[PDB]
Amino acid sequence: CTVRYNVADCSHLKLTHIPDDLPSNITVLNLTHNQLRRLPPTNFTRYSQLAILDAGFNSISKLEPELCQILPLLKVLNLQHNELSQISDQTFVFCTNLTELDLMSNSIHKIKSNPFKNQKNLIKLDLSHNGLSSTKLGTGVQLENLQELLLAKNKILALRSEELEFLGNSSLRKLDLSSNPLKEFSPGCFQTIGKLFALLLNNAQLNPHLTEKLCWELSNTSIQNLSLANNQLLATSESTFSGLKWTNLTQLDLSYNNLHDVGNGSFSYLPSLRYLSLEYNNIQRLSPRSFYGLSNLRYLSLKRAFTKSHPNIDDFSFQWLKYLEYLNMDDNNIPSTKSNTFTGLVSLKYLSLSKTFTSLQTLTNETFVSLAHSPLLTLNLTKNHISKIANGTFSWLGQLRILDLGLNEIEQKLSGQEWRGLRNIFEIYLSYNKYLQLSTSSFALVPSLQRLMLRRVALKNVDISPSPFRPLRNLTILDLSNNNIANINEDLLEGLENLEILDFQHNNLARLWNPGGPVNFLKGLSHLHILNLESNGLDEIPVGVFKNLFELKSINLGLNNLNKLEPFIFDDQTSLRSLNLQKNLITSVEKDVFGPPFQNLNSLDMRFNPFDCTCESISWFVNWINQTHTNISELSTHYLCNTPHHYYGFPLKLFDTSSCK
Amino acid sequence: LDFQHNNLARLWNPGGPVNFLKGLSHLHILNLESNGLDEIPVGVFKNLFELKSINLGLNNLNKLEPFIFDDQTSLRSLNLQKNLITSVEKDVFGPPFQNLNSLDMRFNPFDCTCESISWFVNWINQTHTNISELSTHYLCNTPHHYYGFPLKLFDTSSCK
Ligand SMILES: *[C@@H]1O[C@H](CO)[C@@H](O[C@@H]2O[C@H](CO)[C@@H](O[C@@H]3O[C@H](CO)[C@@H](O)[C@H](O)[C@@H]3O)[C@H](O)[C@H]2NC(C)=O)[C@H](O)[C@H]1NC(C)=O
Ligand SMILES: *[C@@H]1O[C@H](CO)[C@@H](O[C@@H]2O[C@H](CO)[C@@H](O[C@@H]3O[C@H](CO)[C@@H](O)[C@H](O)[C@@H]3O)[C@H](O)[C@H]2NC(C)=O)[C@H](O)[C@H]1NC(C)=O
Ligand SMILES: *[C@@H]1O[C@H](CO)[C@@H](O[C@@H]2O[C@H](CO)[C@@H](O[C@@H]3O[C@H](CO)[C@@H](O)[C@H](O)[C@@H]3O)[C@H](O)[C@H]2NC(C)=O)[C@H](O)[C@H]1NC(C)=O
Ligand SMILES: *[C@@H]1O[C@H](CO)[C@@H](O[C@@H]2O[C@H](CO)[C@@H](O[C@@H]3O[C@H](CO)[C@@H](O)[C@H](O)[C@@H]3O)[C@H](O)[C@H]2NC(C)=O)[C@H](O)[C@H]1NC(C)=O
Ligand SMILES: *[C@@H]1O[C@H](CO)[C@@H](O[C@@H]2O[C@H](CO)[C@@H](O)[C@H](O)[C@H]2NC(C)=O)[C@H](O)[C@H]1NC(C)=O
Ligand SMILES: *[C@@H]1O[C@H](CO)[C@@H](O[C@@H]2O[C@H](CO)[C@@H](O)[C@H](O)[C@H]2NC(C)=O)[C@H](O)[C@H]1NC(C)=O
Ligand SMILES: *[C@@H]1O[C@H](CO)[C@@H](O[C@@H]2O[C@H](CO)[C@@H](O)[C@H](O)[C@H]2NC(C)=O)[C@H](O)[C@H]1NC(C)=O
Ligand SMILES: *[C@@H]1O[C@H](CO)[C@@H](O[C@@H]2O[C@H](CO)[C@@H](O)[C@H](O)[C@H]2NC(C)=O)[C@H](O)[C@H]1NC(C)=O
Ligand SMILES: *[C@@H]1O[C@H](CO)[C@@H](O)[C@H](O)[C@H]1NC(C)=O
Ligand SMILES: *[C@@H]1O[C@H](CO)[C@@H](O)[C@H](O)[C@H]1NC(C)=O
């Protein structure tokens, strides 16, 4: 087995017999994924100190009580994926300390007598996928402290007040009744339970009339979390949920219930709900009175809550949701917005509208007029086929912090008036766009940015003086990768004292680093953390470009052609934590180049390089590798030399340096 | 026969290499430039006696198996420029160099070592083959002492 500290785990050993050779100073034993004839009752004499046993995923036919007598200190008893054709009460008469019983696949058809007259400390009772037909588990009052009762993937036809009366004072935190073909509910079947809080009815095929009758039956109860998923709730009426008007609910779920129509006042009898979900529904439309009465909701999800003839939302449809703060409408097909769609939401702070608009190619200053009176903090608009934005689009939303406009085809000459009205925004998501032309005043109106990534935007004309990034001072993260920049001067990025993260992947900086004077990039970047110039076609590193980068942490210069390693290139990089030079054309590793970066390096990566197995090239590198604990992944595999012929295709570590000094 | 830019690299172990050019005696010029070939197996240029030109440039060829060119006794022009050739061995480029008229292997990471270029340097010193840009685009890439050094100006007195 693994034989780790204290606990013992045996993932896969093809074990067939209970072993007794392992040390006895253990408290947990694992038997998952093993083939056993039958659990012996007398072989546990040696192991009488196990707190719990993970004896599951086993082909055990019959269970004997004597086992859990030899181990009185037994807490978790998992018997899932086992045969267990039939069980009786005599297995649990002198077996009381159980706290966790798991029966997930045992094909237990009928329950006889009272098997649980002695278990007084059990909390979770998982009895599912066993073909159980009647929810009766006993006649007398038992299960004083039972918090979870799982009954799923069985064939219960109905619930009756007499088969559930055996729970006298049980306080069930979570009740599971999923995948049960329930067709009717006897009156008073829920009042016999002491205190029930949550219920699950997934894959239970609830009819709307059956759902209404269930809601009537659920009155007087302390239910707070109710879930109704995978049903035939194609429509909802005013009186459908009226039976829940006497309950104090917290969460209501209606996902995967193909709801087509929402009646007027459907949830008007729910003055205490705080979280609501309508995921994956073919809702035709939402009337303004559909949400009437929901004055206490705080989280609404409308993911895939619309039909393909296209669905639309009327104005003033969210006025009643004055306490909502998290609205999600991802993956929908609303054509466009109106003047009074979001009007009424006075507490919305997190709004997601990803892939929800189809006819909103052009954005004006009337699209987000409804959100002026709402202090939003996050706005998601990805995959919305955004093509053009007008001035004053975000003027109303002056409290925005997180803005998303990526994964679109925006094409426009940015002038800085597109962000007019934004007071204090944290970061802007404009990656993955077809064409965004920058100007000298594009970022002047918003100097409060903290993160700014422009991946795959085909940006151009960024060498214009003054740089558009000049007004940004406290910016921390900047990304201009995958854009194929033609050229850049030292004017850009100047004054970014607070900049920490910089990425220049796929930007062809080859010629920018001797003719016309080398560009002295990275001037005074004290706060820069990680520098990434991977796959920029770099061919030669000019001297004096990594200076003053004392606080730099990581360097990634892979997928390039670097062979001319100038001496003393890395002098101030004494705080480097990870050096990446994989897939380059490095031939020799000299001490004067990689010395200071190797003083306190944590991980190194320069694989796929034509190394030269010679005393002049890798002797210092081989000595350092042999005399360091730096994490070098695939050191023995992808570090083969390319020259000479004798040492071609040989591991870098398998080189003797005792003959050269 | 011209196969420029066709991605024939992996065709020369997918169930055994394909023995292409099987008994193609009358072919005169063969051009397979810029196909990314990485390894040429033995017994692929057999029965090519009348072939005159081979052009395998703009590829990545470093594994030169012995006796690759055995029937290329009538080769007139060999082109291997802009490849990843590191060493030039006699047993590989012997027969093609018997009557070669023009040779082109510029822009290659040559290794200025005794085992690699000694025979090639001697051949260059004692041949009349017309080679363009021989002293400019034939600089070695390793070691550091011989990096960026002309290939023709190599002393073989310390070799053999
Ligand atoms: C359990 O749920 C039932 C509903 O199924 C609740 O019944 C409701 O009980 C209240 C209080 O007894 C009734 O209000 C009363 O109405 C009479 C007129 O009939 C009025 O004179 C009283 O002043 C009082 O307002 C209410 O009508 C009744 N509703 C129904 C539909 O029966 C019951 O309160 C819940 N709790 C318990 C512990 O049963
Ligand atoms: C706005 O909604 C869209 C809906 O798709 C969100 O897109 C999803 O965002 C997550 C988190 O960024 C992405 O997961 C990521 O996957 C990549 C690998 O592709 C992984 O490297 C990251 O660590 C992360 O796990 C997810 O792929 C992405 N889905 C699509 C289709 O783009 C978007 O994040 C939302 N905007 C927010 C929350 O600001
Ligand atoms: C969204 O932004 C646009 C762009 O500024 C605003 O359009 C502006 O609307 C005002 C009032 O309609 C225009 O003022 C008047 O325009 C007429 C010509 O239409 C002119 O003859 C008058 O002397 C007066 O200037 C203004 O010109 C117009 N701007 C542009 C560039 O056409 C629009 O009002 C904004 N919408 C919201 C809701 O903020
Ligand atoms: C959205 O905002 C941009 C940025 O301000 C507006 O572009 C600006 O439009 C004005 C008005 O046409 C331009 O002023 C013009 O300048 C020329 C000289 O170049 C002058 O001869 C004209 O009489 C006029 O004053 C301004 O140059 C231009 N700026 C840029 C950077 O393009 C745009 O018009 C706004 N659009 C809407 C719909 O409000
Ligand atoms: C219903 O389920 C929700 C979701 O788990 C429970 O709310 C969580 O309560 C814990 C405990 O305070 C918090 O840490 C979580 O942040 C809450 N999550 C959400 C989404 O609200 C709620 O307590 C449950 N109702 C019960 C058990 O009656
Ligand atoms: C939620 O719980 C509250 C508190 O128990 C219920 O309010 C009580 O309602 C009864 C009538 O059934 C009154 O006699 C009590 O005086 C009320 N107490 C308080 C503190 O208001 C409420 O009815 C429950 N249900 C809903 C939907 O709120
Ligand atoms: C549900 O209630 C809404 C009101 O919230 C009703 O919508 C109104 O319909 C009338 C008739 O055309 C219009 O004059 C009103 O302007 C509408 N209200 C709003 C806010 O626009 C709707 O008709 C009701 N539906 C049912 C089936 O009763
Ligand atoms: C740029 O970021 C800095 C760092 O947070 C901001 O400085 C802080 O701003 C908050 C906002 O009120 C103040 O409470 C702090 O006292 C400021 N810290 C210091 C050291 O001055 C700065 O305001 C930001 N500038 C812009 C334009 O957003
Ligand atoms: C358990 O005890 C029986 C009886 O001695 C023995 O045959 C068997 O090998 C022991 N171990 C297991 C894993 O059954
Ligand atoms: C349940 O609670 C009632 C009332 O407090 C009490 O009379 C009864 O003994 C309790 N039963 C159990 C099994 O705790």
Cis peptide before A644 (omega within 30 of 0): yes
- E strands present in A28-115: 28-30, 52-54, 76-78, 100-103
How far apart are alpha carbons B75 and B70 in whole angstroms? 11
Encoded tokens for A97: 């300390």
CA distances (Å), A659 to each of A41, A591, A614, A625, B142, in order? 67, 18, 11, 17, 20
Q: What angle do CA A269, A273, A275 make, to 5 degrees?
A: 140
| Of the candidates A303, A194, A180, the residue with the CA atom closest to the CA atom of residue A231 | A180
* Coil/strand/helix, residue A102: strand
Phi, psi of A76 (to 5 degrees): -110, 125
Residue of A nearest to B89 (CA): A645
* DSSP count for chain B of H helices, then E strands: 2, 6
- Distant-in-sequence, close-in-space partners of B15: CB < 8 Å, separation ≥ 6: none
**Residue of A540, A590, A619, A643 to mutate, interface with B, max B Cβ within 10 Å:** A643
Query: Hey, are the CB atoms on B143 and A590 less than 8 Å from each other?
Result: no
Encoded tokens for B2: 């011209």
To the nearest 10°, the Cα dihedral for B148, B154, B158, B160? 110
> Which residues in chain B have their C atom more than 2.5 Å from the N of the next written residue, marking a break after them?
12
- Distant-in-sequence, close-in-space partners of A223: CB < 8 Å, separation ≥ 6: A196, A197, A198, A199, A247, A248, A249
Q: Is B133 exposed, middle or buried (0-12, 13-18, 19+ CB in 10 A)?
A: exposed
* Nearest chain B CA: its distance from A614 CA (Å): 8
Q: Are A458 and A436 in contact (CB under 8 A)?
A: yes
Q: Is A448 exposed, middle or buried (0-12, 13-18, 19+ CB in 10 A)?
A: middle
According to DSSP, residue B119 is labeled: H
How far apart are alpha carbons A356 and A336 in whole angstroms? 9
CB burial readout A303-321, b (16+ within 10 A) else e: bbbbeeeebebeeebbbbb
How far apart are alpha carbons A511 and A527 in whole angstroms? 27
- Distant-in-sequence, close-in-space partners of A517: CB < 8 Å, separation ≥ 6: none
Determine which residue's CA is closest to atom 5 belonging to ligand 9. A43
> In A121-279, which ranges are continuous DSSP H helix?
208-217
Atom of ligand 5 nearest to the CA of A224: 28
Which of A120, A139, A141, A144, when mutated, tests ligand 10's pocket best, judged by the most ligand atoms within 8 Å of its CB? A141
Amino acid at A225: N
CB burial readout A182-201, b (16+ within 10 A) else e: beebeeebbbebbebbbbbb
Q: Which helix (H) or strand (E) holds A380?
A: strand A378-380
The beta-carbon neighbor of B115 closest among A610, A612, A646 is: A646
Q: Are A530 and A553 in contact (CB under 8 A)?
A: yes
DSSP assignment of A341-357 equals SSTT-SS--EEE-TT-B
Phi, psi of A332 (to 5 degrees): -135, 180
* Nearest chain B CA: its distance from A560 CA (Å): 16
Resolution (A): 3.2
Question: If you measure from the C-alpha of residue A595 to the centroid of ligand 5, how many angstroms do you get, rounded to a whole number?
Answer: 54
Which chain A residues touch B if contact means CB-CB below 8 Å?
563, 587-588, 590, 610, 612, 614, 616-617, 642-646, 648
| Of the candidates A405, A340, A331, A404, the residue with the CA atom closest to the CA atom of residue A374 | A340
To the nearest 10°, the Cα dihedral for B145, B147, B152, B155? 20
Q: Are A558 and A580 in contact (CB under 8 A)?
A: yes
* Nearest chain A CA: its distance from B16 CA (Å): 22
According to DSSP, residue B130 is labeled: B
By DSSP bridging, strand A641-643 and strand A611-612 are: parallel
Cis peptide before A65 (omega within 30 of 0): no
Encoded tokens for B96: 């093609």
Q: Are A58 and A82 in contact (CB under 8 A)?
A: yes
Query: Hey, are the CB atoms on B143 and A616 less than 8 Å from each other?
Result: yes
Half-sphere exposure of A270 (CA within 13 A, CB side): 29
Q: Are A351 and A330 in contact (CB under 8 A)?
A: no
Q: 3-state DSSP helix/strand/coil percent for chain B, to nearest 5?
A: 15, 15, 75
Which of A15, A43, A70, when mutated, tests ligand 9's pocket best, judged by the most ligand atoms within 8 Å of its CB? A43
* Coil/strand/helix, residue A564: strand
DSSP assignment of A416-472 equals SGGGTT--S--EEE--S-SEEE--TTSSSS-TT-SEEE-TT-------PSSPTTTT-
- Distant-in-sequence, close-in-space partners of B56: CB < 8 Å, separation ≥ 6: B32, B33, B35, B37, B79, B80, B83
Cis peptide before B143 (omega within 30 of 0): yes
How far apart are alpha carbons B71 and B27 in whole angstroms? 13
How far apart are alpha carbons A215 and A198 in whole angstroms? 14
Q: Are B156 and B121 in contact (CB under 8 A)?
A: yes
Query: A420: how many CB neighbours lie within 10 A of its CB?
Result: 15
CA distances (Å), A587 to each of A366, A525, B147, in order? 61, 30, 10
| Of the candidates A616, A655, A615, A659, the residue with the CA atom closest to the CA atom of residue A635 | A655
**What region does A331 belong to: left with phi over 0, alpha with psi -120 to 50, or beta?**
left
Query: Hey, are the CB atoms on A616 and B144 less than 8 Å from each other?
Result: yes
How far apart are alpha carbons A174 and B104 in whole angstroms? 79
**Residue of A583, A615, A621, A645 to mutate, interface with B, max B Cβ within 10 Å:** A645
How far apart are alpha carbons A253 and A6 in whole angstroms? 42
* Nearest chain A CA: its distance from B139 CA (Å): 14
Residues touching ligand 8 (Cβ under 6 Å) are A 447-448, 474
Give CA A413 to chain center in angstroms.
36
Give CA A537 to chain center in angstroms.
35
Measured from the alpha carbon of residue A326, the closest ligand is 5
Query: A18: how many CB neighbours lie within 10 A of its CB?
Result: 16
Longest dimension (CA), chain A: 94
Contacts of B147 in chain A (CB under 8 A): 587
Q: Give A127's strand partners.
A: A103
Atom of ligand 9 nearest to the CA of A37: 14
Residue reference for tokens 């059956």 = A210
Query: Hey, are the CB atoms on A614 and B115 less than 8 Å from each other?
Result: no
Phi, psi of A32 (to 5 degrees): -70, 140
CA distances (Å), A504 to each of A206, A437, A479, in order? 55, 18, 7
| Of the candidates B156, B123, B154, the residue with the CA atom closest to the CA atom of residue B139 | B154
* Coil/strand/helix, residue A626: helix
How far apart are alpha carbons A116 and A137 in whole angstroms? 8
How far apart are alpha carbons A638 and A629 in whole angstroms? 18
Q: Are A616 and B144 in contact (CB under 8 A)?
A: yes
Question: If you measure from the C-alpha of residue B141 to the centroid of ligand 5, how many angstroms do you get, rounded to a whole number?
Answer: 66
CA distances (Å), A399 to each of A320, A344, A376, in order? 22, 17, 6
How far apart are alpha carbons A176 and A182 in whole angstroms? 13
| Of the candidates A47, A51, A60, A50, the residue with the CA atom closest to the CA atom of residue A15 | A60
How far apart are alpha carbons A264 and A570 in whole angstroms? 70
Q: Are A548 and A572 in contact (CB under 8 A)?
A: yes
CA distances (Å), A412 to each of A409, A430, A525, in order? 10, 13, 32
- E strands present in chain B: 29-31, 53-55, 77-79, 102-104, 110-111, 140-142
